[PDB]
């Protein structure tokens, strides 16, 4: 780390982006069934094997 390949940075980038709470408006859609984001990740709870 701390001097990465563009491939690793890219991945890290994508992971930042996926790292937000459920967008609350979805909760309102007809038949909506998702209550929360159940794929959330925390840097000190689960490492992301690269």
């Amino acid at each position: 780390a701390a001097q990465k390949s563009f491939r690793i940075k890219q991945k890290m980038a994508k992971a930042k982006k996926q790292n937000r709470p459920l967008p609350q408006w979805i909760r309102l859609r007809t038949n909506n069934t998702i209550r929360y984001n159940a794929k959330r990740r925390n840097w000190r709870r689960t490492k992301m094997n690269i």
Binding site: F6, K9, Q10, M12, A13, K14, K16, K17
Partner: protein
Amino acid sequence: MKKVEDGNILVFQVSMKANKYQIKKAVKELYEVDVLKVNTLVRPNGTKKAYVRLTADYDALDIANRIGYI
């Protein structure tokens, strides 16, 4: 905006596939401006940011709210 006001610098998010050459030209062409030099980096969301410095004749601030932001 501070770079625009204080730095005579336009900041653009810019295509990843594009280099300092292509950024410079496209700013020149899309904006009728002369460019001193161009600095780039990759944001942590995987987007390219261009610190575009205009030459002493131009005033990025005008040029900023002539493209229409502020």
